[PDB]
C-alpha cells in the first residue's frame, strides 16, 4: 500500500491523491 | 519497523490535507 | 470551519496510533 | 459523527477505538 | 497573509498553493 | 493568540508538503 | 529522499516555534 | 471544547525541542 | 498547571524553559 | 542522531495521548 | 529504555503506557 | 544549508535561529 509505496521513495502530491476516495 | 511507522504518521496527515472533503481510508 | 479542520488533523494522528494494523475510518 | 463526539469534548483512546478499522 | 485568510475558513489545496514560491 | 499560533503551525506544515521543491514564503 | 523529507517537516515545525514573529523561508 | 487538549500536544512538542537532552517536567495535575 | 498556563496564552521560549529539567 | 530525535518527537506526542492526566517524563 | 524499545520496533499503546508517570 | 547542517546531527533551537528571517 501507500506506506510501502510512499515511505520507500517519496510520493508527489499527485501520487498521494491516488489514495483518496 | 519504526521508519515506516513514523513515515506512516506523516502520510496520513498528508492524505488528510490532499484529499479534502472526499477523505481517504487508511488500512 | 478551521477549528473542525484542526481537530480532524489531530484525530487522524490519534486514530493512526490507536488503530494500528486495523486502520480506520475518517 | 466523530466530530460531534470528539471535537466538542475529549475522547478517551477507548472511545477513539470505536472508529477503527 | 495566510494566517488571516486560512485560520477561520478552510483553505483548499489550491488556495494553499498561492503561498508557494 | 494561542489559536492563531496553532493554526499557523499547521499552515506551515501544509505549505511544506504542498509546495514541494519550490518551498514557500512566510513573514508574519 | 524520504528521510530528508521527513526531517524537513520537523525542521519547519522547529523554525516556526523558534523564529516567532520573524518567520522564515524553508526552501 | 477540546482546545486545551489540542494545544497540549503542541506544547509537549515545544518543550521537547526547547529543553534538549535534559528533558522536561510534565505532570499536568 | 502547564496546559492551563501555556494553552490559555502563548508561552515565550523563556516561559517554556521554566518547564525544563 | 537525528533519527532518534525525530522518533522522540513522535513518542512525546503518543505519550501525551496515552498517558493523559498522569503525564510522563521524556529524558 | 524507550528509544531501544520503541524507535527500532513499533510500540503498542500498552508498551508506551509503561512509560507514563 | 540547513539540511546539511541539521538532518544527521541535531541542531538546537539556538542553531536553528540562524535560519530565521
Ligand atoms: Cl519522522
Ligand atoms: Cl490545533
Ligand atoms: Zn494542532
Ligand atoms: Zn516525523
Curated annotation (Swiss-Prot), chain C:
Superkingdom assignment: Eukaryota
Impact upon substituting residue 22 to Q: In MODY10; reduces binding affinity to INSR; reduces biological activity; reduces folding properties
Name by which UniProt lists this protein: Insulin B chain
Organism: Homo sapiens (Human)
Amino acid at each position: 500500500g501507500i506506506v510501502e509505496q510512499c515511505c520507500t521513495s517519496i510520493c508527489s502530491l499527485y501520487q498521494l491523491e491516488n489514495y483518496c476516495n | 519497523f519504526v521508519n515506516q511507522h513514523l513515515c506512516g504518521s506523516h502520510l496520513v496527515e498528508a492524505l488528510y490535507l490532499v484529499c479534502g472533503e472526499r477523505g481517504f481510508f487508511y488500512t
